[PDB]
mmCIF file of C-alpha atoms in Angstrom:
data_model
loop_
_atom_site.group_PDB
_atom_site.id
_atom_site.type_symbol
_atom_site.label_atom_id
_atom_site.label_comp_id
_atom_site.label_asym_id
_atom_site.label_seq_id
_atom_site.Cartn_x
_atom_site.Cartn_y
_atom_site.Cartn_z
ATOM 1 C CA UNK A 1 0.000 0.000 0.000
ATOM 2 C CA UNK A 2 3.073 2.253 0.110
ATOM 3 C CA UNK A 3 3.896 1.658 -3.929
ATOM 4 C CA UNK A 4 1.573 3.711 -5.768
ATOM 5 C CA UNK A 5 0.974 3.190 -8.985
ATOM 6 C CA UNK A 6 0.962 5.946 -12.016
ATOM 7 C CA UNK A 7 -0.476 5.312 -15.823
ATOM 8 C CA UNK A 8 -1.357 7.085 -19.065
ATOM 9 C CA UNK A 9 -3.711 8.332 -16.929
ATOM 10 C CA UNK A 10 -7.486 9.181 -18.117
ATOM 11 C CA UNK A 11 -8.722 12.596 -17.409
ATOM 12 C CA UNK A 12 -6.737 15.323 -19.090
ATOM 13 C CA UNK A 13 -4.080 18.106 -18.461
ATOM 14 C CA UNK A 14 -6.779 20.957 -18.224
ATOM 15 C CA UNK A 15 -6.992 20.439 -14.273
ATOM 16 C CA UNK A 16 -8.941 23.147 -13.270
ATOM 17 C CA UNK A 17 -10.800 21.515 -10.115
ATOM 18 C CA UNK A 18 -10.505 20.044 -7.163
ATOM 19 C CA UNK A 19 -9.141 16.156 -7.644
ATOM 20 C CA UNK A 20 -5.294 15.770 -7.668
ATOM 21 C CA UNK A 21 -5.301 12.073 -6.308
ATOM 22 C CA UNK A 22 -4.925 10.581 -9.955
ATOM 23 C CA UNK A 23 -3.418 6.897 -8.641
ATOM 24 C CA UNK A 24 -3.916 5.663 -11.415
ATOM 25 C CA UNK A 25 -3.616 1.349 -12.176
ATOM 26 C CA UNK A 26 -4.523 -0.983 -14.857
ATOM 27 C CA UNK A 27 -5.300 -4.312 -15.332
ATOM 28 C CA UNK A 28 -4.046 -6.288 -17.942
ATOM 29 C CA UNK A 29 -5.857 -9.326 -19.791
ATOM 30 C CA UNK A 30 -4.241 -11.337 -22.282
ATOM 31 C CA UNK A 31 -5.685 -14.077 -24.363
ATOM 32 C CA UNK A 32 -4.331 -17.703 -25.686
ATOM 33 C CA UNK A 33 -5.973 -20.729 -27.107
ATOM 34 C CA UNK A 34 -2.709 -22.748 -26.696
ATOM 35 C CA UNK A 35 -4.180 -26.453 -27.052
ATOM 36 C CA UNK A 36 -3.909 -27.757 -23.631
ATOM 37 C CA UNK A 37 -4.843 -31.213 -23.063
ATOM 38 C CA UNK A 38 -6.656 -34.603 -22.567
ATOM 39 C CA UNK A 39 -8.298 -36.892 -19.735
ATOM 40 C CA UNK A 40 -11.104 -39.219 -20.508
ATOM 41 C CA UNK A 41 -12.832 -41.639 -18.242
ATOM 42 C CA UNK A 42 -15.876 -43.932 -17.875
ATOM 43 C CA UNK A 43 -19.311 -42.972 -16.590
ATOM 44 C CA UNK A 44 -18.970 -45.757 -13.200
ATOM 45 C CA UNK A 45 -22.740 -45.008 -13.329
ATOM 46 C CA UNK A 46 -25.768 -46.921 -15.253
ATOM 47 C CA UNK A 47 -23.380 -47.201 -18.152
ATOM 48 C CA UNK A 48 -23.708 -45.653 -21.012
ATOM 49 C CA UNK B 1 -20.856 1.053 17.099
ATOM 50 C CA UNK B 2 -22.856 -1.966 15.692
ATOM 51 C CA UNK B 3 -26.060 -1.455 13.878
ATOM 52 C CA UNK B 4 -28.411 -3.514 12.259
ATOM 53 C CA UNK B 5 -28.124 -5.625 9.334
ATOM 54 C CA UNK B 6 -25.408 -5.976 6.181
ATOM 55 C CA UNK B 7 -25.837 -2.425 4.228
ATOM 56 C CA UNK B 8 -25.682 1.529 4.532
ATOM 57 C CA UNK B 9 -29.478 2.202 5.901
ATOM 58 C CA UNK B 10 -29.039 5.361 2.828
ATOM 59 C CA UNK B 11 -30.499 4.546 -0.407
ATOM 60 C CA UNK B 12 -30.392 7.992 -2.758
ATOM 61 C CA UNK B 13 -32.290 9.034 -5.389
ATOM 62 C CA UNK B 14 -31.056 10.511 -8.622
ATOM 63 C CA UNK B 15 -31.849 12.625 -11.733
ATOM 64 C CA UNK B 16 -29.697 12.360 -14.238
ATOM 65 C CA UNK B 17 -26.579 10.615 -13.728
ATOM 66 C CA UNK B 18 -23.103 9.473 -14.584
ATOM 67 C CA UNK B 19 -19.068 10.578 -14.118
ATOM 68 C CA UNK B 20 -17.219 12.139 -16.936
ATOM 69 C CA UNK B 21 -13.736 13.960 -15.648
ATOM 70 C CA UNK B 22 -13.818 10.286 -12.965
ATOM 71 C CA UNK B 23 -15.661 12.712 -11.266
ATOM 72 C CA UNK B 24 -19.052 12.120 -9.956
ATOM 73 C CA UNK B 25 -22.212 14.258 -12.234
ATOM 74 C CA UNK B 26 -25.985 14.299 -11.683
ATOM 75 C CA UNK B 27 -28.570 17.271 -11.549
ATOM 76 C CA UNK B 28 -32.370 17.726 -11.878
ATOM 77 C CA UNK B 29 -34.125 19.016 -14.736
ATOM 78 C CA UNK B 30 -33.748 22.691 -13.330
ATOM 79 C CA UNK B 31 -30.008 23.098 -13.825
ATOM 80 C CA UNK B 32 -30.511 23.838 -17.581
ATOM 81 C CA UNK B 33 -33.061 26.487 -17.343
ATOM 82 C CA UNK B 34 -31.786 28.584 -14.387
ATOM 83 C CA UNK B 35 -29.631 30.385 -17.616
ATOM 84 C CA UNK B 36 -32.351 31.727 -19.721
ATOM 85 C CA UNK B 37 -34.817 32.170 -16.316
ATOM 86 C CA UNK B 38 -32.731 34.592 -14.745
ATOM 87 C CA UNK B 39 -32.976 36.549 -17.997
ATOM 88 C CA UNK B 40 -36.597 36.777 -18.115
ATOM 89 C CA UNK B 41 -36.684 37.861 -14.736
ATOM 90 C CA UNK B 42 -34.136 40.163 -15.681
ATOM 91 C CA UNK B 43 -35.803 41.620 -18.925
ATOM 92 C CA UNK B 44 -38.235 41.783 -16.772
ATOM 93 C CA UNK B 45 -37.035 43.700 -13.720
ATOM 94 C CA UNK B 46 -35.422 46.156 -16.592
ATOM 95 C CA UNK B 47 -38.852 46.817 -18.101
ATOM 96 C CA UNK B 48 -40.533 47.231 -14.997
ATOM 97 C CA UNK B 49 -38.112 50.555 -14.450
ATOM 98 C CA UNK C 1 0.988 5.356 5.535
ATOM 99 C CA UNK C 2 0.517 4.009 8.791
ATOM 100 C CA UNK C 3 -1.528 6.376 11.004
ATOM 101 C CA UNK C 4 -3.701 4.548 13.173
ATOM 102 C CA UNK C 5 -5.302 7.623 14.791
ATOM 103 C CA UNK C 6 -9.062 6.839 14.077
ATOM 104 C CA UNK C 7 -10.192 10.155 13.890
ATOM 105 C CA UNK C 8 -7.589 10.931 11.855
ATOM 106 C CA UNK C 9 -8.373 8.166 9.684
ATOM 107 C CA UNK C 10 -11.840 9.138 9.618
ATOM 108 C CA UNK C 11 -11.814 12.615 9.247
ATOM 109 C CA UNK C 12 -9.065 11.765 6.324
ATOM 110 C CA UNK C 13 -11.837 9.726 4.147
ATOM 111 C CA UNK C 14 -14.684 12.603 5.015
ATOM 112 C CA UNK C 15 -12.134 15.369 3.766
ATOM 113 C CA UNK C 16 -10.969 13.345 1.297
ATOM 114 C CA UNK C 17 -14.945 12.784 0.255
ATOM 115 C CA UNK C 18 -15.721 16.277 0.555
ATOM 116 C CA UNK C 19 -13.520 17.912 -2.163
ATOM 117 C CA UNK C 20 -16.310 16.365 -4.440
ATOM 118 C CA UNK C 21 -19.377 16.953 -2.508
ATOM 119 C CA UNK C 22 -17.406 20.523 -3.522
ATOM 120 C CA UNK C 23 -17.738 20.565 -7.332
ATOM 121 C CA UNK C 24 -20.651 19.428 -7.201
ATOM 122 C CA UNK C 25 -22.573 19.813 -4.405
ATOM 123 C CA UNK C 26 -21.759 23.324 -4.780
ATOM 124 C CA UNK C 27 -24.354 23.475 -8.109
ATOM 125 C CA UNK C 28 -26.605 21.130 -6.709
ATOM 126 C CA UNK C 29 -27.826 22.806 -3.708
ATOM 127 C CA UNK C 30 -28.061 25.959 -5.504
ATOM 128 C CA UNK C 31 -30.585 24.352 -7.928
ATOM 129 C CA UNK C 32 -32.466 24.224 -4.291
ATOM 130 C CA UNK C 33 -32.324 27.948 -4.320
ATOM 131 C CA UNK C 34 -33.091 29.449 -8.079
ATOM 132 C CA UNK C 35 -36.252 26.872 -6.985
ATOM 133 C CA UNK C 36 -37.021 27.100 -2.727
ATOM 134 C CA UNK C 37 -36.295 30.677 -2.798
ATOM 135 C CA UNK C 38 -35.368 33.658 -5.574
ATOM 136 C CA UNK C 39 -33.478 32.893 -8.403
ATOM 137 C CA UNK C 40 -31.217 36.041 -8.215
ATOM 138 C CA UNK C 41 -28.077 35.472 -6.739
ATOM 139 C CA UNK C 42 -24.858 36.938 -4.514
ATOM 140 C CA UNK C 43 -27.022 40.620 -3.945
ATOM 141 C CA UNK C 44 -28.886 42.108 -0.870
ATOM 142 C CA UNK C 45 -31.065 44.863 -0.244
#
């Protein structure tokens, strides 16, 4: 809690106001299809 | 000190609503008319000397 | 920080939720005065 972040930040420059405490973060998602893998088994119950 | 049960006892009503700068924006319907009102009173206070 | 006054703390998330009940606030009760009372403004007498 004693880090604080920064960023692009969203607002603007014109900053005529009364909000200074920009602390600003982001979150970042990333996306991957990648092919992962296997694993089948048998239904122990009524067959099928 | 503990009261009651699992929320802020203060729901609020609102007008027209939404943030823009981050910063927090509503009003009622009368924010956009107090600019032309004020000049018919006005107008009218003038003619009335 | 690490300030575990709890006034201080407190007071320091009221004041730090006031400088928007500022900007705004500051038209919104107003529009509770050109209605609830005159609409001319700043002038007495």
């Amino acid at each position: 809690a004693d880090d604080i972040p920064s960023f692009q930040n969203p607002n603007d420059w014109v900053f005529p106001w009364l909000t200074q405490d920009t602390i600003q973060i982001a979150e970042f998602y990333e996306v991957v299809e990648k092919k992962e893998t296997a694993f089948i088994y048998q239904d122990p119950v009524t067959g099928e | 000190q503990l009261i009651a049960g699992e929320h802020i006892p203060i729901v609020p009503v609102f007008g027209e609503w939404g943030f823009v700068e981050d910063k927090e924006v509503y009003e009622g319907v009368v924010r956009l008319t107090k600019d032309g009102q004020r000049l018919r009173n006005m107008i009218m206070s003038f003619n009335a000397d | 920080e690490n300030r575990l006054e709890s006034i201080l703390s407190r007071f320091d998330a009221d004041w730090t939720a006031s400088d928007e009940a500022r900007r705004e606030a500051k038209n919104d009760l107003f529009f509770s005065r050109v209605s609830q009372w005159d609409d001319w403004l700043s002038q007495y007498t």
